[PDB]
Amino acid sequence: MARRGKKYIEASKLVDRNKRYTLEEAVDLLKKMEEVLQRRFDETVELAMRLNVDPRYADQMVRGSVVLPHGLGKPIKVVVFAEGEYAKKAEEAGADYVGGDELINKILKEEWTDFDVAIATPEMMPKVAKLGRILGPRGLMPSPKTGTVTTNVEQAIKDAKRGRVEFKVDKAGNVHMPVGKISFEKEKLIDNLYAAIDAVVRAKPPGAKGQYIKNMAVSLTMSPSVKLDINEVLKKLQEKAA
């Protein structure tokens, strides 16, 4: 498709390079970007924060959850990659699709992605990796950052079913949160974004020193990023609270 790349750079031209945007500006750009990108799946809206923490220490771990104000109409369809004891727990907890090598091969070979969230045990991730190419782009790859790689499958399934978004900073201090679909009306996306940003703000650990947030940006899965103005956003956020 000698079309897709023309579309990517056009969408990039919408962003002022070193410009740092308000949430309301950014969601406006995301929508304009999608107008150009015209993707055939409903792109996930992604929040990226880099935090000033070394999570090697317990007291600098950034970990939490938040029920975004606006999510997809329920029920949320949940796939769990699991074997043995964990598969039983998975289905007991109400997972829609529970499976191992067969499930994984069905997804890859039939290009079947009819579900809202994927969770995997740590033991299954090595087998799940080959799903990176179909799931990655659709925001469906199980990841520790979304807390979707775990042996505590029951709590992860229930959290997904309730729209509780889980986050966990990585070793480099980066948090990634999906905060809705681009198909959502903007007012909803702005709401979800304050909600998510506030949650990470409140997760500030006791060992966190100096300037907590070092970078913030929002993206669609396959679009350029929009940098956010950290101090503006935190001001807007504080002004609506205390």
PDB file of C-alpha atoms in Angstrom:
ATOM      1  CA  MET A   1       0.000   0.000   0.000  1.00  0.00           C
ATOM      2  CA  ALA A   2       2.103   2.829  -1.175  1.00  0.00           C
ATOM      3  CA  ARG A   3      -0.602   4.837   0.661  1.00  0.00           C
ATOM      4  CA  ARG A   4       0.054   4.117   4.376  1.00  0.00           C
ATOM      5  CA  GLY A   5       3.325   6.076   4.666  1.00  0.00           C
ATOM      6  CA  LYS A   6       2.098   9.188   2.912  1.00  0.00           C
ATOM      7  CA  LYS A   7      -0.602   9.093   5.573  1.00  0.00           C
ATOM      8  CA  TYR A   8       1.935   8.727   8.377  1.00  0.00           C
ATOM      9  CA  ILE A   9       3.983  11.771   7.461  1.00  0.00           C
ATOM     10  CA  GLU A  10       0.885  13.887   6.817  1.00  0.00           C
ATOM     11  CA  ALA A  11      -0.276  12.996  10.305  1.00  0.00           C
ATOM     12  CA  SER A  12       3.185  13.926  11.606  1.00  0.00           C
ATOM     13  CA  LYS A  13       2.897  17.371   9.980  1.00  0.00           C
ATOM     14  CA  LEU A  14      -0.047  18.048  12.305  1.00  0.00           C
ATOM     15  CA  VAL A  15       2.340  18.077  15.264  1.00  0.00           C
ATOM     16  CA  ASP A  16       4.507  21.081  15.998  1.00  0.00           C
ATOM     17  CA  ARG A  17       7.874  19.443  16.716  1.00  0.00           C
ATOM     18  CA  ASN A  18       9.008  20.759  20.105  1.00  0.00           C
ATOM     19  CA  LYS A  19       5.571  22.079  21.007  1.00  0.00           C
ATOM     20  CA  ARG A  20       4.144  20.780  24.279  1.00  0.00           C
ATOM     21  CA  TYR A  21       0.333  20.618  24.263  1.00  0.00           C
ATOM     22  CA  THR A  22      -2.618  20.770  26.652  1.00  0.00           C
ATOM     23  CA  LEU A  23      -4.823  17.664  26.940  1.00  0.00           C
ATOM     24  CA  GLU A  24      -7.657  19.359  25.073  1.00  0.00           C
ATOM     25  CA  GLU A  25      -5.290  20.381  22.278  1.00  0.00           C
ATOM     26  CA  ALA A  26      -3.763  16.891  22.124  1.00  0.00           C
ATOM     27  CA  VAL A  27      -7.090  15.034  21.901  1.00  0.00           C
ATOM     28  CA  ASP A  28      -8.018  17.511  19.167  1.00  0.00           C
ATOM     29  CA  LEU A  29      -4.819  16.519  17.307  1.00  0.00           C
ATOM     30  CA  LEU A  30      -5.393  12.791  17.834  1.00  0.00           C
ATOM     31  CA  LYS A  31      -8.794  13.136  16.150  1.00  0.00           C
ATOM     32  CA  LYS A  32      -7.353  15.216  13.293  1.00  0.00           C
ATOM     33  CA  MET A  33      -4.586  12.627  12.992  1.00  0.00           C
ATOM     34  CA  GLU A  34      -7.144   9.835  12.691  1.00  0.00           C
ATOM     35  CA  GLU A  35      -9.011  11.834  10.039  1.00  0.00           C
ATOM     36  CA  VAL A  36      -5.830  11.411   7.986  1.00  0.00           C
ATOM     37  CA  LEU A  37      -4.792   7.909   9.069  1.00  0.00           C
ATOM     38  CA  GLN A  38      -8.206   6.384   8.376  1.00  0.00           C
ATOM     39  CA  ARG A  39      -7.267   3.054   9.978  1.00  0.00           C
ATOM     40  CA  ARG A  40      -9.608   0.091   9.610  1.00  0.00           C
ATOM     41  CA  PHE A  41      -9.499  -0.999  13.251  1.00  0.00           C
ATOM     42  CA  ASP A  42     -10.590   1.237  16.138  1.00  0.00           C
ATOM     43  CA  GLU A  43      -7.197   2.552  17.377  1.00  0.00           C
ATOM     44  CA  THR A  44      -6.420   2.524  21.090  1.00  0.00           C
ATOM     45  CA  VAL A  45      -5.432   5.861  22.659  1.00  0.00           C
ATOM     46  CA  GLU A  46      -2.150   5.463  24.568  1.00  0.00           C
ATOM     47  CA  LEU A  47      -0.768   7.522  27.436  1.00  0.00           C
ATOM     48  CA  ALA A  48       3.003   7.492  28.023  1.00  0.00           C
ATOM     49  CA  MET A  49       4.642   8.980  31.136  1.00  0.00           C
ATOM     50  CA  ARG A  50       8.314   8.824  32.033  1.00  0.00           C
ATOM     51  CA  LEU A  51       8.797   9.093  35.759  1.00  0.00           C
ATOM     52  CA  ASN A  52      11.854   9.959  37.839  1.00  0.00           C
ATOM     53  CA  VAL A  53      12.159   6.710  39.819  1.00  0.00           C
ATOM     54  CA  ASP A  54      14.492   3.746  40.014  1.00  0.00           C
ATOM     55  CA  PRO A  55      11.903   0.953  40.597  1.00  0.00           C
ATOM     56  CA  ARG A  56      14.689  -1.391  41.699  1.00  0.00           C
ATOM     57  CA  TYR A  57      13.856  -0.123  45.194  1.00  0.00           C
ATOM     58  CA  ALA A  58      10.482  -0.968  46.701  1.00  0.00           C
ATOM     59  CA  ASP A  59      10.096   2.659  47.799  1.00  0.00           C
ATOM     60  CA  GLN A  60      10.430   3.892  44.204  1.00  0.00           C
ATOM     61  CA  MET A  61       8.028   1.368  42.677  1.00  0.00           C
ATOM     62  CA  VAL A  62       5.142   3.010  40.803  1.00  0.00           C
ATOM     63  CA  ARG A  63       2.175   0.660  40.795  1.00  0.00           C
ATOM     64  CA  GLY A  64      -1.577   1.282  40.872  1.00  0.00           C
ATOM     65  CA  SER A  65      -4.950   1.089  39.170  1.00  0.00           C
ATOM     66  CA  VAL A  66      -7.775   3.401  38.174  1.00  0.00           C
ATOM     67  CA  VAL A  67     -11.262   2.890  36.835  1.00  0.00           C
ATOM     68  CA  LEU A  68     -11.377   5.291  33.910  1.00  0.00           C
ATOM     69  CA  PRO A  69     -14.633   7.303  33.759  1.00  0.00           C
ATOM     70  CA  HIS A  70     -15.364   6.060  30.223  1.00  0.00           C
ATOM     71  CA  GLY A  71     -14.772   2.588  28.802  1.00  0.00           C
ATOM     72  CA  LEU A  72     -16.113   0.235  26.134  1.00  0.00           C
ATOM     73  CA  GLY A  73     -19.644  -1.025  26.636  1.00  0.00           C
ATOM     74  CA  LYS A  74     -19.525  -4.152  28.772  1.00  0.00           C
ATOM     75  CA  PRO A  75     -19.021  -6.947  28.912  1.00  0.00           C
ATOM     76  CA  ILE A  76     -15.265  -6.735  28.263  1.00  0.00           C
ATOM     77  CA  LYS A  77     -14.176  -9.854  26.354  1.00  0.00           C
ATOM     78  CA  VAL A  78     -11.199 -11.480  28.067  1.00  0.00           C
ATOM     79  CA  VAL A  79      -8.601 -13.959  26.701  1.00  0.00           C
ATOM     80  CA  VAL A  80      -6.290 -15.735  29.119  1.00  0.00           C
ATOM     81  CA  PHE A  81      -3.191 -17.652  28.054  1.00  0.00           C
ATOM     82  CA  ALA A  82      -2.723 -20.278  30.784  1.00  0.00           C
ATOM     83  CA  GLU A  83      -2.176 -23.965  31.424  1.00  0.00           C
ATOM     84  CA  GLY A  84      -2.777 -26.278  34.380  1.00  0.00           C
ATOM     85  CA  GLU A  85      -4.054 -24.822  37.635  1.00  0.00           C
ATOM     86  CA  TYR A  86      -4.113 -21.269  36.220  1.00  0.00           C
ATOM     87  CA  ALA A  87      -6.395 -22.169  33.309  1.00  0.00           C
ATOM     88  CA  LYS A  88      -8.965 -23.550  35.805  1.00  0.00           C
ATOM     89  CA  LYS A  89      -8.782 -20.387  37.915  1.00  0.00           C
ATOM     90  CA  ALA A  90      -9.014 -18.354  34.715  1.00  0.00           C
ATOM     91  CA  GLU A  91     -12.341 -19.820  33.656  1.00  0.00           C
ATOM     92  CA  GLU A  92     -13.608 -19.927  37.249  1.00  0.00           C
ATOM     93  CA  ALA A  93     -13.048 -16.173  37.347  1.00  0.00           C
ATOM     94  CA  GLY A  94     -15.096 -15.656  34.215  1.00  0.00           C
ATOM     95  CA  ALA A  95     -12.539 -15.391  31.432  1.00  0.00           C
ATOM     96  CA  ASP A  96     -14.220 -15.704  28.005  1.00  0.00           C
ATOM     97  CA  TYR A  97     -11.420 -17.534  26.197  1.00  0.00           C
ATOM     98  CA  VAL A  98      -8.936 -19.636  28.178  1.00  0.00           C
ATOM     99  CA  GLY A  99      -6.241 -21.621  26.403  1.00  0.00           C
ATOM    100  CA  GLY A 100      -2.657 -22.509  25.565  1.00  0.00           C
ATOM    101  CA  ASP A 101      -0.786 -23.434  22.381  1.00  0.00           C
ATOM    102  CA  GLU A 102      -4.007 -24.088  20.486  1.00  0.00           C
ATOM    103  CA  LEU A 103      -5.558 -20.741  21.425  1.00  0.00           C
ATOM    104  CA  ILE A 104      -2.339 -18.920  20.494  1.00  0.00           C
ATOM    105  CA  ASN A 105      -2.178 -20.714  17.124  1.00  0.00           C
ATOM    106  CA  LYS A 106      -5.842 -19.946  16.411  1.00  0.00           C
ATOM    107  CA  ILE A 107      -5.177 -16.230  16.990  1.00  0.00           C
ATOM    108  CA  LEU A 108      -2.064 -16.156  14.816  1.00  0.00           C
ATOM    109  CA  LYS A 109      -3.144 -18.457  11.979  1.00  0.00           C
ATOM    110  CA  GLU A 110      -6.790 -17.413  11.682  1.00  0.00           C
ATOM    111  CA  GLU A 111      -5.941 -13.803  12.376  1.00  0.00           C
ATOM    112  CA  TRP A 112      -8.647 -13.958  15.030  1.00  0.00           C
ATOM    113  CA  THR A 113      -8.590 -10.938  17.352  1.00  0.00           C
ATOM    114  CA  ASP A 114     -12.230 -10.833  18.596  1.00  0.00           C
ATOM    115  CA  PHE A 115     -11.629  -9.826  22.225  1.00  0.00           C
ATOM    116  CA  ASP A 116     -10.954  -6.746  24.329  1.00  0.00           C
ATOM    117  CA  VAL A 117      -8.033  -7.735  26.546  1.00  0.00           C
ATOM    118  CA  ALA A 118      -5.399 -10.472  26.788  1.00  0.00           C
ATOM    119  CA  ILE A 119      -3.806 -11.711  30.013  1.00  0.00           C
ATOM    120  CA  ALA A 120      -0.950 -14.259  30.252  1.00  0.00           C
ATOM    121  CA  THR A 121       0.804 -16.244  32.978  1.00  0.00           C
ATOM    122  CA  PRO A 122       4.576 -15.587  33.083  1.00  0.00           C
ATOM    123  CA  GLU A 123       5.141 -19.181  31.918  1.00  0.00           C
ATOM    124  CA  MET A 124       3.068 -18.552  28.769  1.00  0.00           C
ATOM    125  CA  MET A 125       4.700 -15.287  27.626  1.00  0.00           C
ATOM    126  CA  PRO A 126       7.521 -17.086  25.757  1.00  0.00           C
ATOM    127  CA  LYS A 127       4.826 -18.857  23.710  1.00  0.00           C
ATOM    128  CA  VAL A 128       2.755 -15.662  23.397  1.00  0.00           C
ATOM    129  CA  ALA A 129       5.665 -13.626  21.898  1.00  0.00           C
ATOM    130  CA  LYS A 130       4.832 -14.779  18.325  1.00  0.00           C
ATOM    131  CA  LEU A 131       1.521 -12.950  18.745  1.00  0.00           C
ATOM    132  CA  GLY A 132       3.497  -9.695  18.902  1.00  0.00           C
ATOM    133  CA  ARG A 133       2.767  -8.885  15.235  1.00  0.00           C
ATOM    134  CA  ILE A 134      -1.060  -9.155  15.325  1.00  0.00           C
ATOM    135  CA  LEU A 135      -1.675  -8.121  18.921  1.00  0.00           C
ATOM    136  CA  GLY A 136       0.912  -5.355  19.360  1.00  0.00           C
ATOM    137  CA  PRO A 137      -0.777  -2.967  16.868  1.00  0.00           C
ATOM    138  CA  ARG A 138      -4.259  -3.554  18.285  1.00  0.00           C
ATOM    139  CA  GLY A 139      -3.152  -2.864  21.876  1.00  0.00           C
ATOM    140  CA  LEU A 140      -3.779  -6.484  22.827  1.00  0.00           C
ATOM    141  CA  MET A 141      -0.325  -7.830  23.776  1.00  0.00           C
ATOM    142  CA  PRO A 142      -0.204  -8.944  27.416  1.00  0.00           C
ATOM    143  CA  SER A 143       2.323  -6.758  29.236  1.00  0.00           C
ATOM    144  CA  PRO A 144       3.573  -6.195  32.790  1.00  0.00           C
ATOM    145  CA  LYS A 145       3.021  -2.455  32.228  1.00  0.00           C
ATOM    146  CA  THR A 146      -0.708  -3.076  32.022  1.00  0.00           C
ATOM    147  CA  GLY A 147      -0.332  -5.762  34.683  1.00  0.00           C
ATOM    148  CA  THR A 148      -1.576  -8.381  32.233  1.00  0.00           C
ATOM    149  CA  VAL A 149       1.293 -10.780  32.816  1.00  0.00           C
ATOM    150  CA  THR A 150       0.720 -12.511  36.182  1.00  0.00           C
ATOM    151  CA  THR A 151      -0.081 -15.722  38.082  1.00  0.00           C
ATOM    152  CA  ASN A 152      -2.877 -13.851  39.866  1.00  0.00           C
ATOM    153  CA  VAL A 153      -5.172 -14.353  36.890  1.00  0.00           C
ATOM    154  CA  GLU A 154      -8.406 -14.152  38.872  1.00  0.00           C
ATOM    155  CA  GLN A 155      -7.741 -10.576  40.017  1.00  0.00           C
ATOM    156  CA  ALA A 156      -6.559  -9.540  36.564  1.00  0.00           C
ATOM    157  CA  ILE A 157      -9.664 -10.918  34.859  1.00  0.00           C
ATOM    158  CA  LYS A 158     -11.982  -9.246  37.373  1.00  0.00           C
ATOM    159  CA  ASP A 159     -10.119  -5.954  37.006  1.00  0.00           C
ATOM    160  CA  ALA A 160     -10.439  -6.087  33.206  1.00  0.00           C
ATOM    161  CA  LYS A 161     -14.154  -6.938  33.478  1.00  0.00           C
ATOM    162  CA  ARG A 162     -14.656  -3.845  35.669  1.00  0.00           C
ATOM    163  CA  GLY A 163     -12.626  -1.427  33.580  1.00  0.00           C
ATOM    164  CA  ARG A 164      -9.991  -1.079  36.298  1.00  0.00           C
ATOM    165  CA  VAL A 165      -6.860  -0.067  34.417  1.00  0.00           C
ATOM    166  CA  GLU A 166      -3.675  -1.430  36.026  1.00  0.00           C
ATOM    167  CA  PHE A 167      -0.268   0.201  35.548  1.00  0.00           C
ATOM    168  CA  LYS A 168       3.278  -0.652  36.600  1.00  0.00           C
ATOM    169  CA  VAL A 169       6.343   1.444  35.725  1.00  0.00           C
ATOM    170  CA  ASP A 170       9.129  -0.362  33.905  1.00  0.00           C
ATOM    171  CA  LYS A 171      12.819  -0.438  34.816  1.00  0.00           C
ATOM    172  CA  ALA A 172      13.378   2.765  32.839  1.00  0.00           C
ATOM    173  CA  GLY A 173      10.600   4.580  34.700  1.00  0.00           C
ATOM    174  CA  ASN A 174       8.028   4.475  31.867  1.00  0.00           C
ATOM    175  CA  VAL A 175       4.312   3.980  32.412  1.00  0.00           C
ATOM    176  CA  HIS A 176       1.985   3.089  29.522  1.00  0.00           C
ATOM    177  CA  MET A 177      -1.795   3.205  29.892  1.00  0.00           C
ATOM    178  CA  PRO A 178      -4.497   2.647  27.310  1.00  0.00           C
ATOM    179  CA  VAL A 179      -7.116   5.341  28.022  1.00  0.00           C
ATOM    180  CA  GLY A 180      -9.831   4.536  25.506  1.00  0.00           C
ATOM    181  CA  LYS A 181     -10.503   4.167  21.785  1.00  0.00           C
ATOM    182  CA  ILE A 182     -10.135   6.941  19.245  1.00  0.00           C
ATOM    183  CA  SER A 183     -13.789   6.334  18.353  1.00  0.00           C
ATOM    184  CA  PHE A 184     -14.719   7.835  21.750  1.00  0.00           C
ATOM    185  CA  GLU A 185     -16.032  11.414  21.743  1.00  0.00           C
ATOM    186  CA  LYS A 186     -13.220  13.793  22.726  1.00  0.00           C
ATOM    187  CA  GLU A 187     -14.814  14.893  25.981  1.00  0.00           C
ATOM    188  CA  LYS A 188     -14.584  11.284  27.076  1.00  0.00           C
ATOM    189  CA  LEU A 189     -10.889  11.031  26.131  1.00  0.00           C
ATOM    190  CA  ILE A 190     -10.022  14.217  27.955  1.00  0.00           C
ATOM    191  CA  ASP A 191     -11.804  12.858  31.044  1.00  0.00           C
ATOM    192  CA  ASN A 192     -10.007   9.511  30.828  1.00  0.00           C
ATOM    193  CA  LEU A 193      -6.666  11.325  30.428  1.00  0.00           C
ATOM    194  CA  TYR A 194      -7.020  13.535  33.535  1.00  0.00           C
ATOM    195  CA  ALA A 195      -8.225  10.438  35.355  1.00  0.00           C
ATOM    196  CA  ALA A 196      -5.202   8.379  34.290  1.00  0.00           C
ATOM    197  CA  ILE A 197      -2.677  11.155  34.836  1.00  0.00           C
ATOM    198  CA  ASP A 198      -4.112  11.904  38.275  1.00  0.00           C
ATOM    199  CA  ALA A 199      -3.877   8.214  39.220  1.00  0.00           C
ATOM    200  CA  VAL A 200      -0.174   8.104  38.348  1.00  0.00           C
ATOM    201  CA  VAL A 201       0.370  11.369  40.168  1.00  0.00           C
ATOM    202  CA  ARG A 202      -1.201   9.944  43.317  1.00  0.00           C
ATOM    203  CA  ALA A 203       0.874   6.737  43.018  1.00  0.00           C
ATOM    204  CA  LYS A 204       3.958   8.835  43.761  1.00  0.00           C
ATOM    205  CA  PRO A 205       6.151   6.627  45.967  1.00  0.00           C
ATOM    206  CA  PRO A 206       7.870   7.823  49.154  1.00  0.00           C
ATOM    207  CA  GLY A 207      11.318   7.353  47.612  1.00  0.00           C
ATOM    208  CA  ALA A 208      10.588   9.559  44.599  1.00  0.00           C
ATOM    209  CA  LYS A 209      12.842  12.622  44.594  1.00  0.00           C
ATOM    210  CA  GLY A 210      12.983  15.904  42.720  1.00  0.00           C
ATOM    211  CA  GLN A 211      10.724  16.239  39.690  1.00  0.00           C
ATOM    212  CA  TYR A 212       8.285  13.324  39.529  1.00  0.00           C
ATOM    213  CA  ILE A 213       7.119  13.419  35.900  1.00  0.00           C
ATOM    214  CA  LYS A 214       9.939  13.799  33.356  1.00  0.00           C
ATOM    215  CA  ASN A 215       7.948  13.267  30.163  1.00  0.00           C
ATOM    216  CA  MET A 216       4.320  12.822  29.088  1.00  0.00           C
ATOM    217  CA  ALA A 217       2.856  12.158  25.649  1.00  0.00           C
ATOM    218  CA  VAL A 218      -0.229  10.662  23.984  1.00  0.00           C
ATOM    219  CA  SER A 219      -0.513   8.531  20.879  1.00  0.00           C
ATOM    220  CA  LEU A 220      -2.706   6.246  18.831  1.00  0.00           C
ATOM    221  CA  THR A 221      -1.185   2.782  18.412  1.00  0.00           C
ATOM    222  CA  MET A 222       0.009   3.548  14.867  1.00  0.00           C
ATOM    223  CA  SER A 223       0.236   7.363  14.891  1.00  0.00           C
ATOM    224  CA  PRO A 224       2.890   9.960  15.786  1.00  0.00           C
ATOM    225  CA  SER A 225       2.997  11.210  19.373  1.00  0.00           C
ATOM    226  CA  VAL A 226       1.833  14.452  20.870  1.00  0.00           C
ATOM    227  CA  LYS A 227       3.918  15.851  23.719  1.00  0.00           C
ATOM    228  CA  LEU A 228       2.007  17.152  26.677  1.00  0.00           C
ATOM    229  CA  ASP A 229       2.803  20.237  28.730  1.00  0.00           C
ATOM    230  CA  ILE A 230       3.426  18.651  32.130  1.00  0.00           C
ATOM    231  CA  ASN A 231       3.093  21.778  34.274  1.00  0.00           C
ATOM    232  CA  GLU A 232      -0.037  23.020  32.429  1.00  0.00           C
ATOM    233  CA  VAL A 233      -1.766  19.655  32.764  1.00  0.00           C
ATOM    234  CA  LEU A 234      -0.863  19.337  36.466  1.00  0.00           C
ATOM    235  CA  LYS A 235      -2.105  22.916  36.996  1.00  0.00           C
ATOM    236  CA  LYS A 236      -5.417  22.246  35.228  1.00  0.00           C
ATOM    237  CA  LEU A 237      -5.622  19.045  37.263  1.00  0.00           C
ATOM    238  CA  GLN A 238      -4.888  20.646  40.610  1.00  0.00           C
ATOM    239  CA  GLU A 239      -7.253  23.538  39.924  1.00  0.00           C
ATOM    240  CA  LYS A 240     -10.149  21.132  39.440  1.00  0.00           C
ATOM    241  CA  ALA A 241      -9.392  19.435  42.759  1.00  0.00           C
ATOM    242  CA  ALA A 242      -7.641  21.502  45.429  1.00  0.00           C
TER     243      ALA A 242
END
